[PDB]
Amino acid sequence: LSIDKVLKKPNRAMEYDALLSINVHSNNITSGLNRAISTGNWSLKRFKME
Amino acid sequence: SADAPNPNNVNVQTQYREAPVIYRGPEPSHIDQVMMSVSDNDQALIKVLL
């Protein structure tokens, strides 16, 4: 979904890797995992099993 | 501080509601360590012990 909005509107030549956008999109893996292990409750959105 | 700021000011931020935390308890106590330090987010922090 991130790189999507890159490839929506093709003004000039857009590559520019859209990598450092992993930062902005990151850390839901990290900080979210913190919040998890501190919570005591695990939400698995693959199995919908909690 | 609790309300919505604007960039319009003159002098006094000087209003301070103070809530110094009392040590309650059924007996005397001592303070042998206090700590002035900061977390990742660059905001002052004090965690002390009795």
Partner: protein, 522 residues
């Protein structure tokens, strides 16, 4: 707030000792209360886009690990400009960026615009322009001030090795503030002088690093830097004190930016200078730009690039302009003489060649002027002082902006003392705001002066009267080269034959849309 039912005591002390929690004034002995109560245990046009606003913000915000706090702070700013409807017609990125940027600037935390702008395609004139505009519509003034002392820390975290760097940091700082003291700090990017000091002290740290690795944090060029290296090398006690003892010499010497030295190589009482005046003149009849521009020596017509026809002339060294509607702009005018007079000359082309097009609607729009005071100046203090009326965005652009409504002009400020002025609607405004703010110039100094008369040279209306004002008087200003300023007929045919040679595709697809106007049927 309340007061005792009897003793009239206003001072209330709440005893928590015995775990009654009972509040009484030391003036009575009667509580005014028993057992204080305590607690226990998206469809909108704006607000949905506000959830978007924090979302994109909060997302892009801490990718830089900027404070969760400061983000919250900037959000309310996005709501502020949202109220002004500053948020309407521009790319949301440039907006959301600037929003955050004003906060960290106001909180003076270590990030840089050129630094922060990079998370996209930004040319940094994009965002810098945006931020500049929301400033035009926001009276937020002096708060965004900068020094390298912030940046150097965040730089060092990228510099690795050991902690001698920190020792070296203190090195650079004394260096830095001295370079601030030695007056070369001004007019250049904080990143540049930052990495400058960082290098110089690393060379003091007897290590081997590279300009590459420096601009890695700095994001400037190398030649950029070493121009500042030598910009130190030329200074006093540069190599003479460059040795050990951590530069015990704190002494100033002089303060001499390279700026006026360029006046040396090129080499009040000084009267300001007329650069150009923006006027405009209406013809009164809309007419074909193509057909009329077909015969001229000076013409350019390319609606693919720009609609109207380009008027330009070597005499009296002017340009002006034309429109399609039968109007034009008058440009290249240092005074009113060459302004209205040449303005009448351009009408001799049309009234000679093209349609009726009298001389109507001559009005000044902008006026430009420049000057120099021949001494270095401290701009930051003025921004530190008049920043209410002044705008200085350090290296966002070297020219300092001043804002005066009386008279209404933006002022162009420099350490060099070269000072430029435009946006003026009147020649007297020049000396008005000019020598009005000159006591600010001579006011701000470190360690001629007479205005003479407020007005001397004749007014604008004098030189406007020096020109024939009657639209029907025409041939009087005809140079007889305006007879020549038209190309011959074959030049119009064959030349035009070439221009249409390319443009028959432009006008082609034009006529193709005009044909789609038939397709309006089906």
């Amino acid at each position: 707030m309340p007061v005792c039912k009897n003793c009239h005591g206003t001072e209330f002390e709440r005893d928590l000792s015995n775990a009654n929690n009972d509040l009484v004034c030391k003036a009575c002995g009667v509580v005014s209360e028993d057992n204080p109560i305590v607690s226990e245990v998206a469809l909108e046009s704006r607000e949905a886009t506000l959830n978007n606003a924090r979302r994109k913000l909060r997302a892009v915000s801490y990718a830089l690990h900027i404070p969760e706090y400061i983000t919250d702070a900037a959000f309310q700013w996005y709501k502020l400009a949202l109220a002004n409807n500053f948020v309407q017609g521009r790319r949301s990125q440039n907006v959301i960026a600037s929003c955050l940027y004003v906060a960290c600037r106001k909180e003076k935390t270590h990030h840089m615009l050129i630094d922060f702008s990079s998370r996209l395609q930004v040319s940094v004139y994009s965002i810098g322009a945006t931020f500049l505009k929301m400033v035009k519509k926001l009276h937020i003034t002096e708060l965004p001030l900068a020094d390298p002392s912030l940046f150097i820390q965040h730089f060092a975290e990228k510099l690795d090795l050991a902690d001698k760097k920190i020792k070296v940091v203190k090195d650079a700082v004394k260096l830095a503030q001295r370079m601030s003291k030695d007056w070369m700090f001004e007019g250049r990017r904080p990143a540049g002088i930052a990495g400058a000091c960082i290098l110089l002290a690393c060379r003091m740290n007897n290590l081997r690093r590279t300009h590459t690795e420096i601009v890695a944090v700095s994001h400037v060029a190398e030649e950029t830097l070493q121009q500042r290296l030598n910009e130190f090398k030329n200074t006093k006690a540069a190599k003479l004190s460059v040795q050990k003892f951590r530069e015990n010499d704190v002494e100033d010497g002089e303060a001499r930016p390279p700026s006026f030295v360029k006046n040396r190589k090129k080499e009040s009482g000084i009267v300001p200078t007329l650069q150009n005046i923006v006027a405009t003149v209406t013809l009164g009849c809309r007419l074909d730009l193509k057909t009329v521009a077909l015969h001229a020596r000076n013409a350019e017509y390319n609606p693919k690039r720009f609609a109207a026809v380009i008027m330009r002339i070597r005499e009296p060294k002017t340009t002006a302009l034309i429109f399609a509607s039968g109007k034009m702009v008058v440009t290249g005018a240092k005074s009113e003489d060459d302004s209205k007079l040449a303005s009448r000359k351009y009408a001799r082309i049309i009234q000679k060649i093209g349609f009726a097009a009298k001389f109507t609607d001559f009005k000044i729009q902008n006026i430009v002027g420049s000057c120099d005071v021949k001494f270095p100046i401290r701009l930051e203090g003025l921004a530190f002082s008049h920043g209410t009326f002044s705008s200085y965005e350090p290296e966002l652009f070297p020219g300092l902006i001043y804002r005066m409504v009386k008279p209404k002009i933006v002022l162009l400020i420099f350490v060099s003392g070269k000072i430029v002025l435009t946006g003026a609607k009147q020649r007297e405004e020049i000396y008005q705001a000019f020598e009005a703010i000159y006591p600010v110039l001579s006011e701000f100094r470190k360690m001629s002066g007479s205005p003479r008369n407020l007005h001397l040279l004749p007014t604008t209306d004098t030189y406007l009267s020096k020109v024939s004002d009657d639209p029907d008087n025409l041939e009087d200003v005809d140079d007889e080269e305006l007879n020549a300023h038209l190309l011959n007929e074959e030049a119009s045919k064959l030349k035009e034959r070439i221009w249409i040679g390319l443009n028959a595709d432009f006008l082609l697809e034009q006529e193709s849309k005009r044909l789609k106007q038939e397709a309006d049927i089906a």
